[PDB]
Design an enzyme around this catalytic site. Structure first.
Site, PDB file in Angstrom:
ATOM      1  NE  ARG A  25      -3.299   2.450   2.759  1.00  0.00           N
ATOM      2  CZ  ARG A  25      -3.251   3.262   3.798  1.00  0.00           C
ATOM      3  NH1 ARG A  25      -2.589   2.965   4.911  1.00  0.00           N
ATOM      4  NH2 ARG A  25      -3.929   4.397   3.717  1.00  0.00           N
TER       5      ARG A  25
ATOM      6  CG  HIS B 252      -1.476   8.911   3.233  1.00  0.00           C
ATOM      7  ND1 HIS B 252      -1.571   7.554   3.513  1.00  0.00           N
ATOM      8  CD2 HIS B 252      -1.020   9.486   4.360  1.00  0.00           C
ATOM      9  CE1 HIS B 252      -1.182   7.318   4.744  1.00  0.00           C
ATOM     10  NE2 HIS B 252      -0.831   8.511   5.302  1.00  0.00           N
TER      11      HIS B 252
ATOM     12  CD  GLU C  72      -4.689   7.791   9.800  1.00  0.00           C
ATOM     13  OE1 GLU C  72      -4.217   8.900  10.173  1.00  0.00           O
ATOM     14  OE2 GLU C  72      -4.218   6.699  10.166  1.00  0.00           O
TER      15      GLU C  72
ATOM     16  CG  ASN D  37      -5.006   3.521   8.887  1.00  0.00           C
ATOM     17  OD1 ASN D  37      -5.174   2.504   8.211  1.00  0.00           O
ATOM     18  ND2 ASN D  37      -4.610   4.665   8.357  1.00  0.00           N
TER      19      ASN D  37
ATOM     20  CE1 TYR E 215      -1.776   3.833  12.793  1.00  0.00           C
ATOM     21  CE2 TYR E 215       0.315   2.978  13.588  1.00  0.00           C
ATOM     22  CZ  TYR E 215      -0.479   3.415  12.541  1.00  0.00           C
ATOM     23  OH  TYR E 215       0.013   3.415  11.269  1.00  0.00           O
TER      24      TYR E 215
ATOM     25  CD  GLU F 167      -1.522   4.032   8.047  1.00  0.00           C
ATOM     26  OE1 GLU F 167      -1.113   4.433   9.156  1.00  0.00           O
ATOM     27  OE2 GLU F 167      -1.724   4.776   7.091  1.00  0.00           O
TER      28      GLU F 167
END
Ligand code: NA
Length: 426
Positions: free
Chosen positions: A76, A119, A164, A292, A294, A332
């Site tokens: 990606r 992005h 995002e 994504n 985290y 991600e």
């Protein structure tokens, strides 16, 4: 014992254009908002910029060879809008040349491209016209997406419209940590709406061009948790609306969260942004959802973010239960680590530990019927960490910026094994 993933599971790694490419002033590329921002005194640590970065624009051949060694089935990456629309009224067909070369290398090594359209590298000339707060941004994005689909269509089976929205809108225009670094909630909420609308326009365009692959959005989601007493549960709901529901609800339910919109109007006044038809366009059916993940809110990585893999397990179940039965892809997941070369090796055991914990969480979801189809590790290589510059390292490959030498970390060798075994084996 072994935690084995589905036979068809897609193992990947992810990057983004401004973060690795460099070649910022070559081939007619115009400045992005991030060129402007990083070059502004005080905006990025140590004054770092993405002029240069990992010089990947030039070194892609060698980079792809490392990808082949790793064994990822998908890579990606993002498309640099400023290489294609460098100034108002100017289109460079040649701006997609790099991506064509990159994609040829990928196909040569049996790696599938996964291309992120946006992005964050908005051309500066669009920001000069209000950027994402201006409705006209939707047509500009559509124009870029159209040319991307026409230039690359056949060769890219997996498209991500936006990376995002929360960061590109709220963090960029409201909090001001990211380009263009403004502090104006009304502007930020207008940006959120136009990002979501542009996503929907791109999906519609994709169907109309009769392309045979898959298209979806990528959302960063940060699960919120209450400390406790009715006020704490309410606090959780506010945080969850701000971070997560503001984007999930429009995409899946075709409305903004009604509990939070009053707070938005309180601090912004009237957004004057929602036009008839918009919410329908935002909620056009996708092929998949990208997430994504985290951390959560309410021990830590080198960013100081809590390591809490249970949040990922809970999140996937929440998506399954409340939002979508569509394929989910973790577009991600990764961690910063204070990495150093000792004797030509980088022993990033903490990174291995982090990814193992998250893949176990993912494996549990799959075991319970979860429709998770793929996992992309952020990142293939150390790169420009936005406001932190080159000071933070998320790669499974170390990059010396002075020499441009790539050194696979312990995490690279470990993840290579994960891919070969199609799962965790400790
Ligand atoms: Na951003």
């Amino acid at each position: 014992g072994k935690r084995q993933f589905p036979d068809d599971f897609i193992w990947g790694a992810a990057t983004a254009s401004y973060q690795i490419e460099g070649a910022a002033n070559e081939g007619g590329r115009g400045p992005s908002i991030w060129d402007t921002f990083s070059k502004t005194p005080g905006k990025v640590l140590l004054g770092h910029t993405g002029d240069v970065a990992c010089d990947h624009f030039h070194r892609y051949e060698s980079d792809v060879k490392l990808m082949a060694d790793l064994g990822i089935k998908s890579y990606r990456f993002s498309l640099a809008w400023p290489r294609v629309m460098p100034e108002k009224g100017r289109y460079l067909e040649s701006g997609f040349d790099f991506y064509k070369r990159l994609i040829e290398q990928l196909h040569k090594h049996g790696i599938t491209p996964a291309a992120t359209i946006y992005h964050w590298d908005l051309p500066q000339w669009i920001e000069d016209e209000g950027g994402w707060s201006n409705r006209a941004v939707v047509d500009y994005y559509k124009e870029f997406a159209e040319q991307a689909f026409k230039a690359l269509g056949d060769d890219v089976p997996f498209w991500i419209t936006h990376n995002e929205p929360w960061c590109a809108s709220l963090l960029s225009y409201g909090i001001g940590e990211h380009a263009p670094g403004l502090k104006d909630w009304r502007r930020a909420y207008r940006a959120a709406h136009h990002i979501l609308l542009s996503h929907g326009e791109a999906v519609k365009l994709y169907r109309e061009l009769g392309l045979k692959g898959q298209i979806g959005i990528t959302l960063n989601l940060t699960p919120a948790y209450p400390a406790s007493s009715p006020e704490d549960i309410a606090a959780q709901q506010r945080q969850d609306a701000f971070s997560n529901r503001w984007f999930l609800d429009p995409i899946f339910k075709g409305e903004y969260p009604a509990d939070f919109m009053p707070r938005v109007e309180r601090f912004c006044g009237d957004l004057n942004v929602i036009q008839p038809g918009d919410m329908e366009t935002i909620s056009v059916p996708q092929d998949f959802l990208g997430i994504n993940f985290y951390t959560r809110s309410v021990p830590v990585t080198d960013m100081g973010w809590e390591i809490y893999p249970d949040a990922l397990y809970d999140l996937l179940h929440r998506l399954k239960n409340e939002y979508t039965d569509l394929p989910i892809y973790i577009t991600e997941n990764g961690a910063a680590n204070a990495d150093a070369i000792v004797n030509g090796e980088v022993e990033d055991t903490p990174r291995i530990d982090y990814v193992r914990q998250h893949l176990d969480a993912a494996h549990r979801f799959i075991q319970e019927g979860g429709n998770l189809k793929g996992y992309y590790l952020w990142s293939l290589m150390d790169n420009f960490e936005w406001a932190f510059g080159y000071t933070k390292r998320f790669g499974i490959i170390y990059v010396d910026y002075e020499t441009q030498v790539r050194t696979p970390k312990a995490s690279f060798h470990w993840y290579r094994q994960v891919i070969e075994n199609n799962g965790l084996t400790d």
